[PDB]
Amino acid sequence: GLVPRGSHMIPALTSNFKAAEGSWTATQGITVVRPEKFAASAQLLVDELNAYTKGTAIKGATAGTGIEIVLDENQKADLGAEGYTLTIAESGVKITAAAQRGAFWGTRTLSQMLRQNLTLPAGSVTDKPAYAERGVTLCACQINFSTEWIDRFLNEMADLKLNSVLMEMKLKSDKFPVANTFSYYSRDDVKKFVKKAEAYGIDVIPEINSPGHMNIWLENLPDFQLKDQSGKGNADRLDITNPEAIKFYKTLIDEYDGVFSTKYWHMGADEYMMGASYYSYPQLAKYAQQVTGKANATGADAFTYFINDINNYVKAKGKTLRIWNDGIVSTRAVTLDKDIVVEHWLGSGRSPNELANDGYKLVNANLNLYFARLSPYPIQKNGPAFLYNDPSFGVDVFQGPYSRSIKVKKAENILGAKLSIWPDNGVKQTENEVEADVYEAMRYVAQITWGGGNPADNPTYADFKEKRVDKVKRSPMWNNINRKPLEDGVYTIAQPDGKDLQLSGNASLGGNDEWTLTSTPDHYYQLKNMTSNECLSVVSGYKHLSTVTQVGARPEARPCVDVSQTFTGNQTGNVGYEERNPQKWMLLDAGDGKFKVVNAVTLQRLAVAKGTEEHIDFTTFNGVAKDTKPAAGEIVQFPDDMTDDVWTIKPSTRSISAIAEATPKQAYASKDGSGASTIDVTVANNSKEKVSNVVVTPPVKRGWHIDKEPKTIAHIAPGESAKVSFQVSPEWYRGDAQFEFIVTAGDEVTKASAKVKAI
Ligand code: NI
Ligand code: NI
Question: In angstroms, rounded to a whole number, what is the distance separating the alpha carbons of residues 577 and 571?
Answer without folding.
Answer: 11
